[PDB]
From Swiss-Prot:
It comes from Homo sapiens (Human). Residues 5-259 are annotated as: Fe2OG dioxygenase domain. The modification N6-acetyllysine is found at residue 159. This is Alpha-ketoglutarate-dependent dioxygenase FTO. Residues 156-167 are annotated as: Loop L1. Its EC number is 1.14.11.-, 1.14.11.53. One of its GO terms (cellular component) is nucleus. Pfam families: FTO_CTD (PF12934), FTO_NTD (PF12933). The gene is FTO. Substrate binds at residues 69, 81, 174-177. Monomer. May also exist as homodimer. It is linked to Growth retardation, developmental delay, and facial dysmorphism: A severe polymalformation syndrome characterized by postnatal growth retardation, microcephaly, severe psychomotor delay, functional brain deficits and characteristic facial dysmorphism. In some patients, structural brain malformations, cardiac defects, genital anomalies, and cleft palate are observed. Early death occurs by the age of 3 years. RNA demethylase that mediates oxidative demethylation of different RNA species, such as mRNAs, tRNAs and snRNAs, and acts as a regulator of fat mass, adipogenesis and energy homeostasis. Specifically demethylates N(6)-methyladenosine (m6A) RNA, the most prevalent internal modification of messenger RNA (mRNA) in higher eukaryotes. M6A demethylation by FTO affects mRNA expression and stability. Also able to demethylate m6A in U6 small nuclear RNA (snRNA). Activated by ascorbate. Inhibited by N-oxalylglycine, fumarate and succinate. RNA N(6)-methyladenosine demethylase activity is inhibited by fluorescein derivatives. RNA N(6)-methyladenosine demethylase activity is selectively inhibited by meclofenamic acid; inhibition is specific to FTO and meclofenamic acid does not inhibit ALKBH5. Specifically inhibited by R-2-hydroxyglutarate (R-2HG), an oncometabolite that also exerts a broad antileukemic activity. Changing residue 87 to D: Perturbs interaction between N-terminal and C-terminal domains and strongly reduces enzyme activity.
Length: 434
């Protein structure tokens, strides 16, 4: 296989005919005022220590990202990739001083790139000519930006790009997942300073999915260049980042698919679960209104959602955003208290199944409704505990140390149920086989 750069004669027609949805807006098209502000904001975030490597999962293996990152975006919004949910450092939208000024700068960059994207999508539809406007607006309505930094000098060995001879990869071939269908992605690239591609300059690489026959494109990225993946390009093509010699930042603006990924969403889910609880007073005497299978099933599913998708995801990062912001401190305190009440709900259901007067047919209905949720709860707890205590997780500093919260010992009387549910789950299974 082979690749094409601006040095190759065929590069320009190949871009035109096979990559019409890839746009490059070079540094000269963007204002020098915006350049200075955005680049100063990158260095502020880096100096204050706001950028961290994510500990992600790829095919059962715990891996640090080669890039250090931070998610900036709408208040209460999240972005999930590689089984790792990032929580936004909020930018000042309608309705810490140096850090908040940088978050305001990246909102200003978001506003600019949104307008550039809309114009590019309007021109794309105009070219395709030779309901529509609402789709273009929503596909360019960037709700987050995920910032990136890498010093390639710090890495002892970078992987060779395997298919096209593109050289050293900073980031391997992938799609950006958890984005709205056909939504655009806009990237501001900030580099700090003759056979194939130039090894000292940063590039973004592109290939068609499933395809190593068709030669890939490697687009050089100089200081302040912007590139846009329009419409279905992100889905139909993989991209990689090829390393240059110097350090480089980027701001990758996305329309995150947050239908089950906002604070407002999960709080509303928690309140739905607690509709089955008598809510006169907050105490340990949790009594339930109904034991209808469907209501109990739902309750235990929400219990799992708030525990694994929100609490354990957040505390796995180890109060890391605490440096940049305290926006999630009270929400996470509230979600844990809501989760604690749902531990009382589970205990109340387990108390009901053991009651003497309950006929066995009603009992077995309840067991069938909750067993899948409790089984998954046991399995995910074991996974999350082991993920927190992995070799690579232990090597991180105290500021970035993963916590397995919530966690409690067998002797802890404040919690109604044990952390380990193995004996409870095996007993409930046994009862069904009676
Ligand atoms: C910011 C990191 C990232 C995000 C996403 C990603 C996935 C889905 N949605 C958004 C982003 C995909 C990749 C490619 C593996 C990356 N890259 C990575 C994420 C974690 C770890 C690594 C490092 N090694 C390197 C040697 C080759 O084996 C693969 C793992 C990479 C990588 O660049 O390869
Ligand atoms: O720009 C970067 O270096 C990494 C961001 C990226 O390419 C991605 O996550 O898809």
């Amino acid at each position: 296989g082979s690749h094409m750069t601006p040095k190759d004669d065929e590069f320009y027609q190949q871009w035109q005919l096979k990559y019409p949805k890839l746009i490059l807006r070079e540094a000269s098209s963007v204002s020098e005022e915006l350049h200075k502000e955005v680049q100063e904001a990158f260095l502020t975030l880096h100096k204050h220590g706001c950028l961290f490597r994510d500990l992600v999962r790829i095919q059962g293996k715990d891996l640090l990202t080669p890039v250090s990152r931070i998610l900036i975006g709408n208040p209460g919004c999240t972005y999930k990739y590689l089984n790792t949910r990032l929580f936004t450092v909020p930018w000042p939208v309608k309705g810490e001083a140096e850090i908040a000024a940088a978050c305001e700068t990246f909102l200003k960059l978001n506003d600019y790139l949104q307008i550039e994207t809309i114009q590019a999508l309007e021109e794309l539809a105009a070219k395709e000519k030779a309901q529509d406007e609402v789709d273009i607006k929503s596909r360019a309505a960037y709700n987050v930006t995920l910032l990136n930094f890498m010093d390639p000098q710090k890495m002892p060995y970078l992987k060779e790009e395997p298919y096209f001879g593109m050289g050293k990869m900073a980031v391997s071939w992938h799609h950006d997942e958890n984005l709205v269908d056909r939504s655009a992605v806009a990237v501001y690239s900030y580099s700090c300073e003759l056979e194939g591609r130039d090894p000292d300059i940063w590039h973004v690489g592109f290939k068609i999915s499933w395809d190593i026959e068709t030669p890939g494109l490697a687009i050089p990225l100089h200081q302040g260049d912007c590139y846009f993946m329009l419409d279905d390009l992100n889905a139909t093509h993989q991209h990689c980042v090829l390393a240059g010699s110097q350090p480089r930042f980027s701001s990758t603006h996305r329309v995150a698919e947050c239908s089950t990924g906002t604070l407002d969403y999960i709080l509303q889910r928690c309140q739905l679960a607690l509709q089955n609880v008598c809510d006169d007073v907050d105490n340990d005497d949790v009594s339930l209104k109904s034991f209808e299978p469907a209501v109990l099933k739902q309750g235990e599913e929400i219990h799992n959602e708030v525990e694994f998708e929100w609490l354990r995801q957040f505390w796995f990062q180890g109060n890391r955003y605490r440096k940049c912001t305290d926006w999630w401190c009270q929400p996470m305190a509230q979600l844990e208290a809501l989760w604690k009440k749902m531990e009382g709900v589970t205990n109340a259901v387990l108390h009901e199944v053991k009651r003497e007067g309950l006929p066995v047919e009603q009992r077995n209905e309840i067991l069938t409704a909750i067993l899948a949720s409790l089984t998954a709860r046991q399995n995910l707890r074991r996974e999350w505990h082991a993920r927190c205590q992995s070799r690579i997780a232990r090597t991180l500093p105290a500021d970035q140390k993963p916590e397995c919260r919530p966690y409690w010992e067998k002797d802890d009387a404040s919690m109604p149920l044990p952390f380990d549910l193995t004996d409870i789950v095996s007993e409930l299974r046994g009862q069904l086989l009676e």
